[PDB]
Amino acid sequence: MVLTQQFVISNADLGRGHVVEALHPSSPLIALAGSKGRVLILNKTGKVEHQLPMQNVVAMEWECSTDTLAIITSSSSDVHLYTHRTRQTDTIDTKLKDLCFVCWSQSQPLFAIGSKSGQFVLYNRRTLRLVPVADTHKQRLISGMWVPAQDSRLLIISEDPSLSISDAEGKVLTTIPLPSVPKSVCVSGMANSPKSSSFAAVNLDNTLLIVDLRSYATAAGQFNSALGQITCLTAGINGEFLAGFASGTVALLDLAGSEVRLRGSLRLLKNAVEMVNFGEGSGVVAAVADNRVGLLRITEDGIAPTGDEASLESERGVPDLLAWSRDGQQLFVGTNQGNVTVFTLKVLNVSASYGTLVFSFTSNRTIGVKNLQDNRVVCTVPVNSDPAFISAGMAMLAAGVNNQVSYYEYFIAHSVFLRTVEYPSPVTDLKVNSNLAA
8 A cells, every 4th residue: 555644643732531532424524632621623724713611521422413512511410512603502401410421313313311320311302391211220321322224222231231122212111131241232223124123132241142122032152162252242234243252263253043154264363353343434344453453355255364564653552442434534543542543545536337337446446346226236346556547348447547557357246357558648538348448
């Protein structure tokens, strides 16, 4: 790849302390917070429009629907809705101080307010209705994220092991005891499922549990003792789950009913992968361990070595937080001491078309051929560089930079490199069919 250094932002401009992330799915704006009582606001041009006095940052999140920003204080039960666009202030009283977390949902204006004492209330603003349901939580809430699907049901983990499922009115149907305390869980719903199939994943440390929310059927699955515990678990796109392991072998699982199958195990890395992060915008699983970052590519045959590793300087520190935005245009490295590193991933906005096929860059070096009828990628082609332009055709795809062009025969699902030519002048316009090229 090609690497450039733009700027170095010192922690002295931010201050020591933890930084709460807020991953905007679409807008490439990242919030930089400080522990010294000031927040640094920077746009793409590097201009600070305003400085705002606000201390005791707890948890921030975006809102894709209304673009409304909140402000929470650690000493007051009031929450202040601050909008930079409209400059209007509204105070909502939670009647309890030391709030745990406040989250916003991009689906509807339905935001959940929790408390460390376990008391939660529903504030229907449109109907001005208060729905209090007590004894639902007993201790401090930790974390919780809304599901980007039709099912707008939020699960929050706590230190006491218990499972509670309720409807929108908060009626407690039953309480399920757990063998061990859960650590982390991400739930993905299926909006386009015609029969609305839903399953729940429970991390019981030594055992992964699958719960059917429809039939209430549980199946016991035992893994080998040499496989080790599940270090981390995350959910991908369309039922894909990535589970970490202590043996250094990374594998992809598929829900085959009540039984699981092993396609193959290989010790790609001797050390165990600390964190496994799935990107919805590029399909790239990056392994960050100590001062090393490794990338992964999806192919039909299997797992092959990348052959490239990046050496990270230990003066800044060990990256202990990896995150990927939904659009997949920027690369992030976050630490709990305030050091945030941002890198630019310049995707090429050059596409081609041919009948029912759209040629678009699905990765940095891979062009996917989406089918308009099927609404899905049906083939891919690896390109050895980043072309200035691409030209479609039938059983042909050309990728050009400056005054040279490389060809790729393809069929629909294998793509074959053909040749590369260079021309005495820059290639202004290029068209191609299966046999000739203009």
